[PDB]
Ligand binder design. Structure first.
Ligand code: DGL
Ligand code: DGL
Lengths: 254, 260
């Protein structure tokens, strides 16, 4: 398309703002259209065909509006629909699983890699299968279903949530992982808590951070960066559910 | 006072507006902590100053924050930590967290080939604070490079494209030749270049964010001393102050806080 076209970003809800904020941090001149599917999410407890239906509806709307690139900020939606998206859209698609996978394989020292995410992300085996091409690595994947509710309620330090994480992460500790993928939009807000649980030696990998660096790479190489001397960037935020409820909760992630 | 009340605020200070990346990362982790942030826009940038000039500026702000009763002090500025951390250990009795040591410990743990790079202001690099802090790390080789233009590039919003890539390829060339696989972003502004730097350094280089590691340290410190502000306390208060022009601080802060 045109370098002046927006970047589309979408998510199951409000937590994908961690990805959007990281993209905007790296790319202050890009126009952005963010859509959070608060009308139909959370995607965490849904089935894969349910998630794909919801995500592709938003994907089709954003591509229909002329975005030059589509970013799937939700790890659950990335599991359910990257296959479809590759073939369905002609714009480049960035998502949140593969940039982290590549970072984790480069960052590990003993080859033992963990990943945490929603039930739907972990049950899909997107991470387990994506890591199968990595020589000399052992993957341990664990769903952490209550993490999302604790992040949104703002309860991310202290004894209650620390015990919750110790119970979730025990298999990763037992497996002696030295690298841990935060495979969910909400989990960067728990990186201090998770690091305390896992100890100093474990490298945490943020989906938001790696994906934003990948958007920089992708727009640079296909020569579609919106120019610095273009007008001030426009950033549009839309919700499929209650816009006022979205605005209230977004303060937690912005 | 080692131990103030858990209801006391956390003090964060910086040479100006760039330390908001550290304060935002702290607030991300710790939504129920009261924050007082002071950014020394009236005397910055610290990057081109001497160590004694930086120290005197920074301690004047630490003195204010401590006198307000903060329960912990975060030196968010890598130039300032280089110049005054030593003084702050004796001058202040509340816990002091800063941005050099957490990233050093991370870098030591994250490297695979033992080759570690660090970039920062001229003051930070020529102080040898990173070179000396790494001396205890056996089987490591440190390469340190000052990147003086990175700060104004970040602040004026120019962080991708050919111009800033060519500028970054020139700075980072010694690190590529040294074959580092780990790079400490030893400056407050550099997280806003991490995509540009990752692109110049290749995919095998692990970038280490001062903001991120220091925020995780604050979570750990407050937890282990049991000084976390409780979730059922009133909503957290977050004060941001500038020693220089208030309207310029607000305009520049937009770059580091992100969309409203
Ligand atoms: N955005 C989702 C988390 C919230 C949800 O379950 O909808 C994810 O990254 O997996
Ligand atoms: N805060 C400074 C960058 C800006 C300045 O030079 O004052 C640092 O982290 O080194």
């Amino acid at each position: 398309n045109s370098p002046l076209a927006p970047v589309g970003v979408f998510d199951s809800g409000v937590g994908g703002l961690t990805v959007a904020r990281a993209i905007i941090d790296q790319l202050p001149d890009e126009d952005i259209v963010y859509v959070g599917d608060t009308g139909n999410g959370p995607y965490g407890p849904l089935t894969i065909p349910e998630i794909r239906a919801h995500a592709l509806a938003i994907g089709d709307d954003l591509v229909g509006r002329g975005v030059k690139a589509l970013v799937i900020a939700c790890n659950s939606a990335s599991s359910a629909c990257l296959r479809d998206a590759r073939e369905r859209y002609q714009v480049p698609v960035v998502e949140v699983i593969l940039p982290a996978v590549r970072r984790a394989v480069a960052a590990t020292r003993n080859g033992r890699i963990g990943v945490i995410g929603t039930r739907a992300t972990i049950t899909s085996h997107a991470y387990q299968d994506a890591f199968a091409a990595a020589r000399d690595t052992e993957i341990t994947a664990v769903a952490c279903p209550r993490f999302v509710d604790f992040v949104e309620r703002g309860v991310t330090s202290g004894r209650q949530v620390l015990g919750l994480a110790q119970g979730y992460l025990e298999p990763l500790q037992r497996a002696e992982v030295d690298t841990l993928v935060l495979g969910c939009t909400h989990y960067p807000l728990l990186s201090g808590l998770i690091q305390l649980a896992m100890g100093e030696n474990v490298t945490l990998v943020s989906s938001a951070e790696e994906t934003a660096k990948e958007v920089v790479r992708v727009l640079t190489e296909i020569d579609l960066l919106r120019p610095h001397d273009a007008p001030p960037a426009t950033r549009i935020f839309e919700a499929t559910g209650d816009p006022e409820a979205f605005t209230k909760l977004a303060a937690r992630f912005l």
